Each structure stands twice: as structure tokens, then as C-alpha cells.
Predict the structure.
Amino acid sequence: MIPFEALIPYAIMFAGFCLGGGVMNSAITADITKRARGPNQEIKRNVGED
Amino acid sequence: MLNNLFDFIEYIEYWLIIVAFVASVLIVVAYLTVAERKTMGYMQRRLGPNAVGYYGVLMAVADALKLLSKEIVLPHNGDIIYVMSGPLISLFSVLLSWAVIPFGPGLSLLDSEYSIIYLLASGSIGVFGTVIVGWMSNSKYTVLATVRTTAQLISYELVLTTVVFIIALIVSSLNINVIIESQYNIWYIIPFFPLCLIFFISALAETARPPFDNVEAESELVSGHMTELSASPFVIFFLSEYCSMVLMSTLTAIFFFGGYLPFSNTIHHLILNLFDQHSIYYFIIEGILLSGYLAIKANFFMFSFVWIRAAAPRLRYDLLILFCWYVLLPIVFAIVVFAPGILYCFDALPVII
Amino acid sequence: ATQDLPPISGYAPIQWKRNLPSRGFRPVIWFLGLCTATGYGFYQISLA
Amino acid sequence: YSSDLPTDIPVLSKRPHTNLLDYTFTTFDKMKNWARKSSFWPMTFGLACCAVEMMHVSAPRYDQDRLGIIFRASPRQSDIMIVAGTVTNKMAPALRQVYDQMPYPRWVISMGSCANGGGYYHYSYSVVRGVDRIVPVDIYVPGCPPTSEALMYGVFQLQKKMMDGQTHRMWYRSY
Amino acid sequence: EESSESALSKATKWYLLSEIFRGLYITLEMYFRAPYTIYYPFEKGPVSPRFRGEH
Amino acid sequence: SSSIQRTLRNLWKNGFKKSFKQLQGYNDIKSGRLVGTDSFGNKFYEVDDPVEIHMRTRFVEYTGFWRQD
Amino acid sequence: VSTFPLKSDINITKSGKTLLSVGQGGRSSRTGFTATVFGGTGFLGRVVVSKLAKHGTNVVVPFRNDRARRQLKVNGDLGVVNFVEFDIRNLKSIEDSVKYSDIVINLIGTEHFSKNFSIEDVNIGAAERIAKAAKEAGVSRLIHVSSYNANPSSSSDFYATKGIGEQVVRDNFGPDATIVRPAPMYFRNSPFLNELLQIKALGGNVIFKKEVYPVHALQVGEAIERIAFDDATAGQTYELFGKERYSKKELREMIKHIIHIGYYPYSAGFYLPAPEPFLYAFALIRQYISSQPRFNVDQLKRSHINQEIDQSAKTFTDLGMVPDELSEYLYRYVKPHIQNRTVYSKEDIEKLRDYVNTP
Amino acid sequence: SMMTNEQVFSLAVEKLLNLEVPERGQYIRTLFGEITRVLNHLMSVLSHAMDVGALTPFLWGFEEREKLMEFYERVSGARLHSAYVRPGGVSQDLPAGLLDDIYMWATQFGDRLDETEELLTDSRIWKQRTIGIGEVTAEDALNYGLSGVMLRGSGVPFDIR
Ligand SMILES: NC(=O)C1=CN([C@@H]2O[C@H](COP(=O)(O)OP(=O)(O)OC[C@H]3O[C@@H](n4cnc5c(N)ncnc54)[C@H](OP(=O)(O)O)[C@@H]3O)[C@@H](O)[C@H]2O)C=CC1
Ligand SMILES: CCCCCCCCCCCC(=O)OC[C@H](COP(=O)(O)OCC[N+](C)(C)C)OC(=O)CCCCCCCCCCC
Ligand SMILES: CCCCCCCCCCCC(=O)OC[C@H](COP(=O)(O)OCC[N+](C)(C)C)OC(=O)CCCCCCCCCCC
Ligand SMILES: CCCCCCCCCCCC(=O)OC[C@H](COP(=O)(O)OCC[N+](C)(C)C)OC(=O)CCCCCCCCCCC
Ligand code: SF4
């Protein structure tokens, strides 16, 4: 008889790690990539059609 | 505006990451306290907190807010230095010790080949924070838990330090990220199972958790050092004990259960093939997955912190100091002369690739 | 009848002696399992 | 000087909410009181047979912890004093000292007939005829001993009173 | 010299915490059992006709 | 009596608003046959669920929402 | 205190009420009276309520601070101390505070003003409305409390409203209303001995040059007891004070040695001298920034005024009580803020006075 | 130990009264003389373990106390201070169906003791807290008048039953 009410805090602690990790993996990757696109801000932001 | 606001974000982006990091740790710590009572409640046929917020979700909120709005008891009105300084050292050390834990490959605030030393050094500052709480007090119960507190943390620090160094010896690196990646083909719980029991036993003592509970023993020394703590000094010191629980549970996952590595490489591969690597949606899923593997491994040990508390009677202090010196330390030095021998015999001395 | 009484044939016997049967393998087998895991573990460490 | 003092301003527990700053201070009151109601940490001051029923409230069947009630062994960490048992003359000065050491806000519950008014030992040479001769008592739980549900009804009644407090709206209006 | 257990058996139980791991396991059995708690004041414990309460 | 199946079945039988009230004061999602209502307005149910534990086969639904006496 | 607060067990009031006391004067005894202490949750009210309830006199305590009144009940037996919620902007409540009473006491007053009440509304408006309602409620005796320098011509707002407050009472209740003008009352947790012990006293030299006469808060409480229970004190004005003259600058320094507090008093901020135009400015700002009663502008003017004794009024010898000197009571009220413990008797304290003034 | 307390006053007064309880009354006082003994040790053994550190075994047993206090209340009307045993016998007869509840509790209660002996009897931490602690010699126990279990622990086989 698995108690789901007992495991509610763990599913929230699982989300705590995922929240921090999901942000760090994506935000740092996006920033590194964007600054590696060109030497000015009008290049970094926009994506060319070609 | 739209061009003079984007650069505002790019000038504030790395502060939002840190706040998301701090919130990530505090959410785990806040809901660790509930999970401790919810779990230990169901092993005692109770229910645990389920009345403060739907199913007790807002239980840490109420306890923290209740104590944050209590009257702080200072020996004299302007003695805020004495009450706060003890817990403040403890909180900063364990919050700074979170700076080396990676949630994925490279996703840690501090990355340096001396991460393991930084982690052991930071913890020893917290030890200094703990003994200071009682050492500025005349209460007999509070000042009782300094000489016994000091040696208990001193004695099991050698055991915890040596175990970390044996794992660092097997990979020949004092970097947290290198240790995790070194466990791809094997998890160090299989070769070094005895060290994991020794690591977990030592981890309990360092956080003063039961059965190594003699510092803050309610039946013995009431609240220990906290019998003179109330309102904010109680929460900050209480928060520190649970930041360490989350940390030391994560450290056991890192050193013996592969850290953020997947339980199955196939399931990891199949899940990620549903997302395109050219869109930022792929990297959110990987970060959620990689922290998910760590979270599940870490949760199992935060579970075991509570689980052992509900199953083992408290261990007597005099028999507690002799345990780490006359039993654990010889074993830990025996292995540290054993692992280099096996590695050399098969020409397998480690190098940092 | 008109009082609280046990049945005619009485109640069935209950369990009151100690019931703690031991569980798990022999202690030697656990030690063999430990030295198998240690041996295999250092095989995989030495391989990598 | 000049004082234009009205006569029709309702007393604080009756005053309806009119402007926005009433709700702002009311919300700060509800959030503050909700936390104090939910983190109802008493102090383990069991003295006699009334304490046995106090422990049974924490037993699995009733499980006071499920409501956020954790018995604390120190006044510093406690805000509720539960007098569970007979208050003798010899114990009386200690009870006052323990009471004075509790930081505000604090509430006291009197459980059972001994604490309430002496009870069976009302005509004894060594029993205080009611703990309300030593400390202020916020609610009286009747019984010998009060059942576990009777004690929980007393705790529930006090929480309803704590949620009715207006500590901060009082400053904005009564002060 | 009259201990039936061999040296290794006594030390495997000692080093691997034989009875403690069992003690944990029995506690974990309770985790998958129905608790006892009743949700007063929405439910009440049993009462009998002989009960003494308010006069 | 603690499994999420027991909470799922009771959640569906009551519907949202009845179950949301129990998720606010009762802390548990239960469903039972209605037995009667008293002079104050409280309604008293009886639980037929074969898994419900010994002392939890009867309960009340108080008239108020945020408070119960 | 003693064992019986009365001189006789039958006491007839101005209204023909015959009150017969029963018992020996302990907790279970009664006096037949029924007082109403306004502001009984205040500093002076707690001592006054305690003495009345200690001897079985029913006391109605109107309150506004719900928690601050709880500790009042310990002083009286069952049914003795009664609580009536009230607000001076509500009339019905005050007309119920005095409905069944036989004595009305008015300790309500302020030296600070707030966003909801000014000093004019409290020292004058409240006392007037109390006396008007206490008269229409058939109360035999009213006792009022004002400041020690009640003078409607004072430039200070506190003594401006306190002086006018005396008139509007006798102009409302009548020529029977007693009046009490206590000196600065010192006691445990007293507002007077507090600012003398407060460490970071900003503008110390500006504030502590004011000279007063110390007086025991208990004697003021016991004096109010004798006044209510005696009908020969109706319409009389009492000026309650001590004999020996003390200056706050003397006290703030005599206290300093008892506290035992070299470099530290200067570094810790014990001395914080201040130009007066700044103090008038900072105390000006905290009137609308601080949410708590801070040392305000009007209190600053009082520091320029020493205590005045209105010699046409009465003293403790009228009550047959010897006034208590601060010499014998200063020490026991600083032990909370305080080898061998250093105990100061009357001789020790007087010698300590000599050292402060000696250069 | 509420009912055994009032059993020693009943025995003393009946002894002075030269009276003897009828047969059924004596069985009821033995039946509730042992229910009370189980109630006491559940309170004593398990709170003793709680001081030593074992929090959980306390909670398991105190649900048995709730189940046993139900028998106290069903016969007398009070969970704790049942004035049931009196000089001359007991207050009232047993209610119908009480025997069938004492039995149904008795079938299961044996397993409740085993789960207590699981966490404590063989635990090395429990045996470190107790073995060699508070030793009493038989000569010392008889001199200080130690009785009950703190006299049979010292090896003397004496029992007042
Ligand atoms: N050393 C001293 O204390 C001296 C004081 N006095 C005067 O004696 C009088 C009594 O003051 P004291 O007891 O000593 O100390 P406090 O200043 O604390 O007493 C003030 C009393 O008046 C009440 N009060 C003020 N404003 C209101 C209001 N709007 N509505 C209802 N009640 C109000 C207060 O109620 P609440 O507590 O709930 O706020 C309090 O009970 C004062 O007028 C004071 O100026 C004169 C000489 C010496
Ligand atoms: C495998 C990884 C998980 C377990 C790790 C720890 C192993 C402990 C046992 C070895 C020590 C020892 O001494 O083992 C031997 C002992 C004692 O045997 P005995 O009393 O002589 O048996 C009597 C005679 N027989 C052999 C005929 C029966 O057996 C045990 O107590 C087994 C305990 C099993 C339950 C605990 C495991 C579950 C814990 C949580 C897992 C998630
Ligand atoms: C070679 C393989 C290496 C394996 C390394 C592992 C060793 C671990 C310790 C074994 C020694 C021992 O348990 O010792 C017991 C010691 C000291 O006992 P003592 O004073 O010597 O008396 C007994 C021995 N006599 C009679 C021979 C002298 O105290 C204890 O009860 C410590 C119990 C700690 C339990 C903490 C909880 C566990 C949490 C982790 C699981 C969830
Ligand atoms: C930095 C800090 C972060 C925030 C901290 C969180 C604090 C927890 C919240 C306390 C809740 C509480 O107390 O909810 C319960 C309390 C007390 O209800 P009562 O005593 O019965 O009176 C209230 C009921 N009446 C007056 C009608 C009798 O109010 C309530 O019923 C609030 C009812 C309206 C809620 C509207 C919420 C609007 C949405 C908010 C989210 C989107
Ligand atoms: S009131 Fe009754 S149950 Fe409570 S302590 Fe007194 S005698 Fe015991």
C-alpha cells in the first residue's frame, strides 16, 4: 500500500533539483552560443535567413 | 523599447541563474523538513503534517514564518552579536559548499581542480560555527554541548576526510566533475561499498543526526545548543542542519552512485532523441534529466537520513568517540594502503584525462 | 445468555511465544558477495 | 485645545473594512496568525495523569503532528504552555519561572481539574487551587483527565482565537 | 574457544551491521501499511454508553 | 486506505466542489452514502469502501468552509 | 496591602449606596465596591488594578489591546476582574465601563500623538467624555490622574493639555472630582527609569538636564487606593512627589556605575551629544517615518522645564503615608539590568551621588 | 497501572471486611489486572526506549494502548481513571461482546511484541546502552527493598502473584 501523500514532498524535492539544473543547462548554453555568433550585438541577437 | 531592454537582461542574466540556483537548493531544504516528518510519520503509522497547505505542502512556510516572527531573546538588548554569529557561520559555510556541486557536466558555479579540498575546507568552517554557539553562553545545558560537540565533529572529520581522499586517489583528481565522469563504466558503490557505509556513518555524525545525536539530545541535553536559541537564530541554525543533510546526501550520490549519470544509457538516449539539438528545448530536457538522476539518487539518501532515525536508538557518546578511532580509522587507513596496491599491480594508476 | 460469556467450546489458541525467525544468507556468503563485488569493481576501475 | 471626538466608531473586533490600507494590514495579520496557528509548538509541561492523555494526542490515532503540533522541551522554542497535572505549592515558583522565560506571543492552556481549580486535591495543604493563581490562562480544558479529543478541542478552540487576532490592524486603527 | 560461530561469521555480521539492516527493513514494512490516524474533528473515537462526560 | 487509487475513486464520486471542500478542511478526499442532516445543517455520511480503516467509516461535512467547530 | 484596605466594613457613597464588606481582606474577601480603572493595561493601571483586585473589589478594566490585558486577571478571584472592550471614539463602550461601578479612575493620557489620536483628543477629549458619562451613570466618586506640572499656560503641549484636562473634568463631573498629579514614577519597567538606562541615548546632554522629583509607583498606586476608599478626599487636588531633589543628569550617571559600563561607553554610543536644531529635525522626521512612539518634539520642550510644585495642593502627609525616597529603591529596580554581587544600601547610593558631582 | 492500584485498596478493605469477591469478580480483576499490566509496560518499556533514542517503538505500542484503553472505557466509562474495581468486587458487569474484543485483540497482539523486539532486543546500539549499566546485586536489592522486576533482574525468583 504505497502512500502517495508521503511521497508528495519528494516529488517537490525532485522538482527542486530539476528547476536548478534545467535553468543552468539551458541558460549557460544559450549565452555561450549567442556570444559565439559574431563580434557585435546586431549579429548576436538576430538570426540570418541564409 | 526592445533593444535597450534585451541588453538589460544580458547584463542581469547571470544573476537570475544564481537566484534560480539558490531557490533550487532552498526548495529542497524547505521540503526536506516536511519529507522527514511525512516519512517518519508513515513508518510510525502516523500521518505527519498534512494540514498546513493542501496535504501539508506549506509546512516549512509556517514553521519558518512562525519563528521569524518570534521575540528574539538576547541576554541584553544589544547582544545580537552573540546569538546570530554562531548560526551565521554555519549557514554561510554550507551555502558556500554548494558552489562546487555540478547539476550536469560543467554546471557548477565554481569549477577548479581543487573542488574536493574546497568542499572539505568549507565544511570545517561550519564545524567552527557550531561549537561557537554554546561557547558564548552561560546556560549549563548549552555550554555542556561544546566539549562533547567539539570532539564528535573533530573525530569523525578524519574519517570523512580520508574517505573523500580515497575516491580522489582512485581518479587522481580533486575535481568534483572529474570524479563523476570517472564512474561511467562502474559506480564506486560496487568496488568501495565499505567506504559508502563509512561515508554515510561519518556523514550522520558531522550533521549531528541520530543515532549520533548526543549533541542536541532532548532526553539528555534538551535542545543542546538550541535550548538558548529562539526566533531567527533558531531557524538559521536549523536551516544549516538541513542544508548539510541535503548536501551530504548529494555527496554520497556523487562519490558512490555516479552523480548525474543516468541509471540507463539507453533510456537516456531514447528520451533525448525526441528533441532537436538545434533548439533550446533539448537542453532544458537534458538538464531536467541530468538533475533528475542526481535528485533520485540524492533523494534515496535524504530518505535514509530519516529512515535510520526511525530505526536506530541513539548511540552513547563515550562509545561514539571510540568507534571512529578504534574501528573506522584503522579500516580507512587499511584501504588507503590497499587501493594503490591493487591499482599498481595491474598497471592501472589513474591519470586525469 | 444474559451475561458476557465465552463460547461453549472456548476460543481458539493464540500466538504468544516469540516469533523471530532469522532471515538472509549465511554470513560466509555475504562475505563472498562482498569480495566478488570488490574484485569486479577494481576490474572495471583497472579497465578504465 | 480642540478635539472633535466621534462616538460612533465601532470597537476593533467590530470595525468593517473600508479603505485599502485596512486590507493591507489585515492580510499581514492573517499571514502572521496563520503561521502561528499552524506551527503550534507547545511546551512539555506534563505533571501528572493529565500528561498521559497529552502523550496520547501525539499517538498514531490522533497524531497532533499532522496538524503542525510539535512538543518542545524548552521555553525558547515553545509558545504554548500546557499545564497538564496538579500544581503543588513546591512546584508553583518553578511554574512561574518557566512561564516568564517564554518569548512572546505566548498562550497558556489549563488541562484537567487539577490545573483548573484544584480538582480532587482542592482541600489539600500542598496544592494550588487553580494554576490561574500563578499564570494567566487562555483556555480551560475540563475533565479528569480530559479525553484526547477534549484536549484537541481545546487546542482547536485556541487556534480559532489566534486567527481572530488583529495585532497589526490594531496599530493602524486603535493606535 | 567455545563460540560456535567462526571468526569470519562473527566479523561479517559485525562489519556489515547484520541486525541493523534487518531493523531498517522491519521499519520499512510499516511504510506500506495503513496508518491509524483518524481525522478529528471530522471523525470521533469510539464511545460507549457508560462514558462519563458533561453533567 | 492511503493509496492514490482510494483518493482517485473518492475524487471522481464527489466531483470537484465537494472534493475541494474536503481538500480544504478534511485534508482527505472521502465519499460516502448520506445518512442525515442535523438541525445546524451538518451532513453525516457513512463509508462503504472495503479498505477504510476501523474508526474512519463515518464522518461529517460541516456547514462552514474555512472553520469547523 | 497589609491585611484590610478599609477602615470600616460599611461604606456609604454619595449616591446612597450601602456597601458591606465580607471576609478578612484576603483573596476570597470582598469590599462591596466596584471600580473602573481606565487604561488599566498601562504602566500605572497594572499596579492600581492589582491592589484593588487583591482585596476583593470588583474592577472593570476597559481595554483595546487584547493580549496586554490577560495578565490583569491573576490579581483577582473568580468573577472579580471584568473586561470590557472599548475605544474612546466609541461612547457606548464607555457608558458600559461605568454602568455598575462605584469608583471611576482615569489613567488615560499621552505625551505623544499618533496618526489616529492627537494629544488634544486624548488628554482633553477622552477625560471630558469619561467624566460626562461617569456623571450620567450615577457614579459616586471619580479619581483623575494628570501630569506633575499641570498648567494650562505652559508652552509645552503635554502640560497644556494636562492642565486643561483638570478643568474639563470638574466642569463635567462636578466639584467632587479628585485629582492626582504624580511626579515621575520609578518602578520596574518604568518609562522614567528606562531612558536613564537606555545605552544609545541620542542627544543626552539636551534631554538629561531636566530636573524632577522621584516618586514610587507603588506609593502612587497605594495613594490612589486611600483616595478612592475615603470620602473626605472628594474635590481635593493631590500633588504626589518625593522629598529629595534629583536631576536626570545625576541619575543617568549614578546609574552608570551600578551598571558597571573605559573606551567602551564612548565607543558603544552611551554618550551621543547633539546640536539642538538637529534633534528638533530628527525627532520631526520620526513622527511620520517611525511606526513606534519615538522621542518627539514636544518631549524636547519638556527637557527645558524643571518640575514645578504647586504648593497649594496636598501631599502624602495628608494620607498619613511617608513618601519613599529613590535612595532605597533605585538599586532593586536596576538589578534586571545589572566575585561578590555589589549591593547598594541607602548609604551606598547617597555616597554614589557625591561621586558623580565631584569633578 | 490504574486498575491494579484500586485492586490493592479493594483487597485490603475486603480483608478487613472479612469478605470475599465471588468467582466471576475475581476473574474480571485478573483479566483487567493483566490488561493493566500490559498497559503499564507499553508505557514503561517504550518510554524507556524513547529516552535512549528509539522513537518509533514508542508510537507502535501506543496504538495498542489506545486499543486497550477502549476496554477500560467500555466497562467503566473512563479511559484512564476507571473507578471500576471497588471493595467487594467491580462496579458493573462486563458489557456484552467485550470478551470477543479482548480475544480479537489478543490474537494479533503477539505480533506487536515481536515488532518491538525486532528494533530493540538484538540491536547492538540498544545493548550498548543497557548491558553493564545499572547493575544491582541480590544483596543490595534485598537491602534497599527493591521489588518487582528490579529484584528478579538481580537473580532472585520472587513474585507476589
Ligand atoms: N513615570 C510615569 O509613568 C509618569 C506618568 N504620568 C501620567 O500618568 C498617566 C498614566 O500613564 P502610565 O500608566 O504611567 O504609563 P502609560 O503612558 O503607558 O499609560 C497610558 C494609558 O492610557 C491609555 N491610552 C492612551 N491612549 C489611549 C487611547 N486612544 N485609547 C485608549 N487608551 C489610551 C493607554 O492604553 P494602552 O496601554 O492599551 O495603550 C494606557 O493604558 C499618563 O497620563 C502619564 O502622562 C505622570 C507622572 C509620571
Ligand atoms: C545486498 C545489498 C543490500 C543489503 C546490504 C546489507 C547486507 C546485510 C546482511 C549481511 C550481514 C550479515 O551478517 O549477513 C548475515 C545475516 C545474519 O545471518 P544469521 O543470523 O546467521 O542467519 C541465520 C541462519 N540462516 C543463515 C540459516 C538464516 O543476515 C541478515 O541479517 C540478512 C538481513 C537481510 C535484510 C536486510 C537487507 C535489506 C536492507 C535494505 C536494502 C535496500
Ligand atoms: C573489512 C570490511 C570493512 C567494512 C566497513 C564497515 C564497518 C562499519 C562498522 C562496523 C563495526 C561496528 O558496527 O562496530 C560497532 C561499534 C562499536 O562496537 P564495540 O564497542 O567494539 O562493541 C561491539 C564489538 N565487540 C563486542 C566485538 C567488542 O558501535 C556501533 O554499534 C556502531 C553502529 C553504527 C550504526 C550507524 C548506522 C548505519 C548507517 C548506514 C546504513 C544505513
Ligand atoms: C514572503 C511571504 C510569502 C507568502 C507567505 C504565505 C502565507 C500563507 C497564506 C496564509 C493563508 C491563510 O491564512 O488563509 C486562511 C485565512 C484565514 O481564514 P479565517 O481565519 O477563517 O478568516 C478568513 C475567512 N473569513 C474572513 C471569510 C471568515 O484567510 C482566508 O480564509 C482567505 C480567504 C480568501 C483568500 C483569497 C486568496 C487570493 C489568491 C491568492 C493567491 C493567488
Ligand atoms: S485533573 Fe485528574 S487526570 Fe488530571 S492530573 Fe488531576 S487527578 Fe490526574
Observations:
- Chain E touches chain F at residues 34-36, 38-39, 41-43, 45-46 (CB under 8 Å).
- The longest helix of chain E spans residues 18-30.
